[PDB]
């Protein structure tokens, strides 16, 4: 089997809803350290705890503020798609990356739930192949005709990674970021089951953890 064709998006293509938070979070107190060289807004971050990032016309730490990680499109370089055991293609990345890391934004076309359903009656054969995230109230991020490399990140029922839900200059946007320091060579996975949407037709799940949940959604 040859991987799935898609159109490749660079952000997120707004169909018929806006996933707005409710509030532009703004101006942390986070001291932009001395030296050019260090990055802030690290830790303690007034934004990062509730999961915004800082905007960077109000941020104390200008240039350094590693607290925009989506906005700049901050995605490792180092993703390969390859041919995946029994899962039909997967991602891997070539080389290590560290536990708490921006990996990439997942992207799609934003749709309500509603037009997402029309597409799985009138295009998808009742079958999105999780290719899908839950973003917020009702809207969902498609990304079986449009998105990036990120729609062929595979599940695990022992995930390494998993997808946030970042308020990004007053919308909700979803990184994946990586849930365990990984070697070079590791196949990228997440868990649908939390992330992904509501599709009833299940599937068998080939993770191969030792307690593997058998099924997955
Ligand atoms: C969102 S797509 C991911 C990329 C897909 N493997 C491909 O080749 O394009 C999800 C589909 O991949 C396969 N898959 C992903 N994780 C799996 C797993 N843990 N066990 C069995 N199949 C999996 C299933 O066919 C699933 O419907
Ligand atoms: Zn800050
Ligand atoms: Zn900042
Ligand atoms: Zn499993």
């Keep these: ?67 925009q990680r989506i906005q700049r499109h901050e995605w490792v370089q180092c993703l390969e798609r390859f041919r995946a055991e029994e899962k039909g293609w997967g991602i891997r990345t070539k080389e290590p990356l560290k536990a708490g890391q921006f990996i990439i934004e997942y992207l799609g076309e934003v749709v309500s739930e509603q037009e997402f359903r029309n597409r799985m ?50 919308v909700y946007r979803i990184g994946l970021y990586a849930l365990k320091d990984m070697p070079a060579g590791t196949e990228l996975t997440y868990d649908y089951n939390f992330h992904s949407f509501n599709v009833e037709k299940q599937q068998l799940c080939k993770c191969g953890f030792e307690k593997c949940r058998g099924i997955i959604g």
């Design 121 to 170: 009656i009138e295009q998808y054969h009742n079958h999105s192949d999780f290719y899908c995230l839950n973003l917020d109230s009702g809207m969902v991020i498609d990304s079986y005709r449009m998105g990036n490399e990120a729609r062929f990140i595979n599940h695990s029922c022992d995930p390494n990674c998993e997808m946030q839900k970042w308020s990004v200059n007053g």
């Design 1 to 67: 089997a040859m991987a799935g064709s898609y159109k490749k998006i660079r952000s997120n293509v707004y169909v018929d809803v806006k996933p707005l938070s409710g509030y532009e979070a703004t101006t942390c107190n986070c001291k932009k350290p001395d030296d050019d060289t260090r990055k802030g807004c690290v830790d303690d971050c007034l934004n990062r705890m509730i999961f915004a990032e800082c905007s960077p016309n109000t941020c104390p730490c200008g240039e350094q503020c590693c607290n």
